[PDB]
């Protein structure tokens, strides 16, 4: 979209920044949710 | 100074920007969990 | 103060202008909206080698006579063409008025091509093509419109590949000319001691016969490695806005700003809704790379941090050059003959410096930052280029981080 | 001279302009 | 006051090597494009002082007191000349103030 | 209204006309050419030209480029043999500065040396940049073998000469010929009266007639130098009229008879031109008035081997002309050619202004255009022989460059 690039991209700045943001929010989400995969993957053997 | 201080207008937004970059990278690398804490993302 | 260029139409289409000044003696040319953009590959050097067969004899005026009758009153005959427009146009006195009008009229309609001079017209264009060549900057210029408006006819060159040049016939010719020499489609202009209505009497009288019936920025570069040149010509452009947009005054303004290689001239080339924007250097192989480093910096600062002195500079500067008002006759109505066929209306030097004075730091740091920050740029280099960068590097200098 | 020859044609390579510059 | 300075100037020690004063100044960049625009003879006697001082201060020596440089007689020589260029240089950046 | 010329009590002219143009020009005339030169300080107004820019005793150099670049005005040096000329345009708004730039130019310079040390290479790049074509080298090489002393000076600083020039030889140069009684100051689009006021901020300095120029003395000669060029650039000339004198005119009606050049952008353009034809090859007449002497005579480029025949060729078609063999419409045509070439040149407004400025210095008086084409008018056909047989009579002086194998030499010519 012409908005992200317009806005976002841009600027060089706004291209740390979002990757900054992006950065911050990344972990939390592939943590998780590879937490749970690997959770998941080893449903039963853990020490619960 | 004034051609100094228009320049400066021009770069005080994205200088400011990059700071702010800078700030969140801070934040996130820092794992700083008091001003992460408030945000709505949890580290547990 | 100075007075407005008067703009009538004929049955024909062909719209009249005269701008009447004291000077005694005038410029009455002829502009015709055809260029090498309209030709189709088939025909890409017909305007260039009816330009050349446009002076040698007409069927009431056949062969040399012709130009004895412009020698007779002193005149001056010239004739150019770009990629757009055509242009014959004739400096003469203003009591000879009449007469040259009359031989602009033979010239556009009525103009006999002999097949003998067909063949010697053929050698001179062949010849001088193989010559042209040599001059650098105009084979630099050719590359850059090639490289950056591939696929188009806008790539094209006004002169056509020798191989048209040889393969012309009269028939091809003629539909050159009787397709792209529709009244609709040309000015007749008039600059100096000249009175509109005598003009305009003079257009009806002869001059009314004449019948009534996108482009692609390819951001690429061109590089012709010859390293037994002396000297290396780079030029650098973007996509330039066009002929209607206003803001190409805004841009020439930053071009009065720029004005390290031992040449180093701004261009701004506009042609319907294309151009190129950009800059063109002449420079030793051991110094190309600093050039270029130092010009993508100076473009980049205009978008990045432009005071307001410098604007003011470039206003003035501009202005002054655009002052065309009594520079010459022959420049005047040039201007007055580009005018009618690119917008359509004479844009008087008042509205010019309105939209000048409308200039601000602000404005033109926004507007250059539309057209050059962060845009593929079209390369062409002749000579020691090997120093020269490639597409990254100068990629990477149309911005900054 | 230069006018022999024309770019050669990328447009196996040309993808499918500012409408798009910024898309792209 | 002059004789104070004429005391001090004894006590800097440079007239001993045989130096000018203004052979003393640090070469700034103003202080370079002053002694480059100074004539022929003047910049071969900064030179030839110059090197006959640094070669008596490699021997660890002075010159005999006959031949020292009298505080009357030193000569501002790139006194002038710098001036300009620190004139020019202000003007210079003025008009890049504004 | 039209031009207005006060001559001031200390010799300065002061020429002017309001026009109301948005651009206005101010230019300055002096009789310091070339020709005032000698052996000893050759090649002193080039430098002297190319030193326009430098620190002046009221304007430092940084203000004498971004004070004239600030306001957009434009500062040039033309120089002749006989005149320089200083000219300034710019927006009416700021002409005020632009004659204090431009009168501490021409009155009061400084003449650093470290300044002029810096321009002898820009004084060597010049000269190269000049003589990158044929037409200058040729034209030089002309006058140096057509004169002895006065107006055989080149244009151009000589090789050995650059690296020799000083501040006292420009001073002296300036000193004895910028003087008041030479000088002339021509506005178009200002008031007259802001010119009689600034001619007195300055050029009131110096009052006197200048150091007034040797005699220019004939000495006929002909140069050849083999340069390679495929084409024989050769110049054949004598020695004509002053600019003054009637027979001048007659000279000029005689070119464009002859031909001066294509008036197309290149056929029977001309007797010259005419005169069989089977090759390429360009001819013209050449003609340069200076004050106190001319040169009259032909211009041939031409394919190396036929540079013989075609150059005969020529010259006998001014031998045919020294013969009476002419036609009165050619010498009517020749003189529509004439005052529409001179009306085309004082159509622009730097032309103008340069035309004025010479009249002025020349003659003191401004002839109206229309003055001048009834007195083109009065040259009449005998008139024009009689030129042409002055030039085929005279002593010749032949420059010549190419590969000069079949070039004939003025004996056999």
Redesign the interface.
């Known amino acids: 979209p012409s908005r992200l690039y317009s806005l976002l991209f841009r600027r060089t700045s706004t291209f740390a920044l979002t990757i900054a943001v992006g950065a911050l929010f990344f972990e939390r989400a592939f943590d998780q949710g590879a937490d749970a995969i690997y959770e998941h993957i080893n449903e039963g053997k853990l020490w619960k | ?4 201080r ?2 400066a207008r ?2 005080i937004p ?1 200088a400011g ?2 700071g ?2 800078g700030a ?2 801070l ?2 690398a820092t794992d700083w969990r008091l001003i992460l804490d408030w945000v709505p ?1 949890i580290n547990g | 103060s100075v007075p407005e260029t008067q703009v009538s139409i004929l049955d024909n289409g062909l719209r009249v202008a005269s701008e009447q000044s004291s000077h005694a003696t005038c410029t009455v040319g002829v502009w015709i909206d055809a260029g090498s953009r309209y030709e189709t590959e088939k025909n890409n050097g017909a305007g260039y080698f009816l330009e050349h067969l446009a002076f040698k004899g007409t069927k009431n005026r056949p062969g040399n006579a012709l130009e004895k009758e412009v020698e007779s009153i002193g005149a001056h005959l010239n004739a150019y063409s770009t990629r757009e427009h055509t242009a014959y146009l004739i400096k003469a006195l203003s009591k000879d008025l009449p007469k040259v009008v009359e031989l602009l009229a033979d010239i556009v309609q009525n103009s006999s091509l002999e097949d003998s001079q067909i063949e010697k017209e053929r050698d001179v264009i062949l010849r001088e093509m193989q010559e042209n060549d040599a001059s650098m900057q105009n084979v630099v210029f050719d590359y850059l419109h090639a490289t950056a408006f591939q696929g188009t006819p806008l790539a094209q060159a006004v002169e056509g590949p020798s191989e048209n040049v040889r393969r012309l016939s009269r028939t091809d010719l003629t539909d050159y000319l009787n397709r792209h020499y529709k009244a609709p489609r040309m000015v007749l202009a008039a600059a100096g001691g000249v009175e509109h209505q005598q003009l305009l009497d003079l257009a009806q009288k002869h001059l009314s016969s004449v019948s009534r019936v996108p482009c692609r920025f390819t951001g690429s570069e061109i590089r012709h490695r010859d390293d037994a040149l002396p000297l290396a010509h780079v030029a650098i452009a973007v996509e330039g806005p066009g002929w209607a947009n206003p803001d190409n005054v805004t841009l020439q303004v930053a071009n009065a700003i720029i004005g390290l290689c031992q040449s180093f001239q701004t261009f701004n080339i506009s042609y319907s809704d294309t151009g190129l924007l950009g800059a063109h250097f002449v420079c030793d192989a051991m110094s190309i790379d600093d050039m270029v480093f130092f010009l993508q910096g100076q473009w980049m600062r205009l978008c990045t941090s432009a005071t307001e002195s410098e604007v003011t500079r470039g206003k003035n500067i501009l202005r002054n050059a655009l002052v065309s008002h009594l520079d010459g006759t022959t420049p005047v109505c040039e201007d007055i003959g580009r005018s009618l066929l690119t917008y359509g209306r004479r844009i008087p030097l008042a509205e010019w410096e309105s939209r000048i004075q409308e200039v601000d730091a602000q404005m033109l740091r926004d507007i250059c930052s539309k057209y050059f920050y962060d845009q593929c740029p079209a390369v062409a280099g002749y000579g020691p280029i090997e120093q020269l960068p490639d597409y990254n590097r100068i990629r990477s200098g149309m911005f900054w981080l | 001279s230069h006018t022999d020859v024309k770019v050669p044609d990328f447009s196996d390579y040309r993808r499918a302009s500012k409408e798009s510059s910024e898309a792209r | 006051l002059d004789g104070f300075r004429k005391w001090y100037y004894n006590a800097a020690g440079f007239n001993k090597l045989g130096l000018m004063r203004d052979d003393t100044l640090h070469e700034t960049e103003d202080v370079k494009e002053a002694i480059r625009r100074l004539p022929e003879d003047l910049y071969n006697d900064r030179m030839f002082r110059i090197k006959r001082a640094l070669d008596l201060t490699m021997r660890h020596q002075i010159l005999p007191k006959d031949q020292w440089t009298k505080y009357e007689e030193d000569k501002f020589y790139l006194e002038p000349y710098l001036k300009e260029v620190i004139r020019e240089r202000k003007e210079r950046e003025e008009w890049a103030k504004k | 209204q039209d031009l207005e010329f006060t001559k001031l009590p200390n010799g300065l002219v002061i020429a002017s006309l309001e026009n109301y143009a948005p651009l206005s020009r101010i230019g300055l005339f002096v009789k310091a050419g070339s020709r005032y030169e000698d052996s000893n300080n050759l090649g002193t107004s080039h430098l002297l030209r190319l030193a326009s820019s430098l620190t002046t005793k009221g304007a430092s150099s940084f203000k004498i480029t971004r004070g004239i670049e600030a306001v957009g005005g434009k500062l040039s040096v033309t120089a002749t043999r006989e005149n320089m000329a200083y000219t300034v345009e710019g927006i009416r708004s700021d002409i005020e500065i632009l004659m204090e730039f431009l009168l501490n130019v021409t009155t009061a310079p400084e003449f650093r040396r470290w300044e002029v040390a810096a321009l002898r290479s820009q004084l060597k790049i010049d000269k190269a940049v000049a003589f990158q074509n044929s037409q200058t080298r040729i034209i030089e090489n002309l006058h140096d073998v057509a004169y002895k002393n006065a107006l055989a000076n080149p244009l151009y600083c000589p090789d050995y000469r650059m690296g020799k020039i000083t501040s006292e030889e420009l001073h002296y140069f300036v000193q004895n010929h910028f003087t008041s009684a030479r000088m002339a100051l021509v506005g178009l689009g200002v008031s007259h009266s802001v010119l009689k006021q600034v001619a007195e901020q300055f050029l009131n300095m110096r009052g006197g007639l200048g150091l007034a120029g040797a005699k220019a003395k004939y000495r006929g000669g002909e140069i050849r130098e083999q340069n390679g060029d495929n084409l024989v650039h050769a110049a054949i000339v004598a020695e004509s009229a002053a600019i003054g004198n009637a027979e001048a005119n007659a000279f000029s009606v005689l070119q464009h008879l002859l031909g001066a050049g294509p008036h197309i952008k290149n056929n029977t353009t001309s007797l010259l031109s005419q005169s069989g034809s089977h090759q390429p090859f360009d001819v013209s007449a050449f003609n340069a008035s200076y004050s106190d002497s001319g040169l009259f005579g032909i211009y041939t480029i031409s394919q190396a081997a036929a540079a013989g025949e075609v150059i005969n060729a020529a010259y006998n078609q001014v031998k045919a002309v020294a013969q009476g063999n002419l036609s009165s419409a050619d010498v009517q045509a020749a003189k529509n050619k004439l005052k529409a070439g001179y009306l085309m040149s004082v159509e622009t407004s730097e032309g103008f202004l340069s035309e004025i400025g010479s009249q002025a210095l020349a003659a003191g008086s401004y002839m109206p255009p229309s003055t001048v084409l009834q007195q083109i008018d009065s040259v009449a056909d005998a008139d024009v022989v009689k030129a042409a047989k002055k030039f085929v009579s005279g002593k010749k002086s032949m420059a010549a460059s190419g590969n000069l194998g079949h070039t004939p030499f003025l004996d056999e010519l």
């Open positions: 100074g004034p051609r100094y228009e320049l021009n770069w994205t920007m990059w702010t970059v969140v990278g934040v996130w993302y």
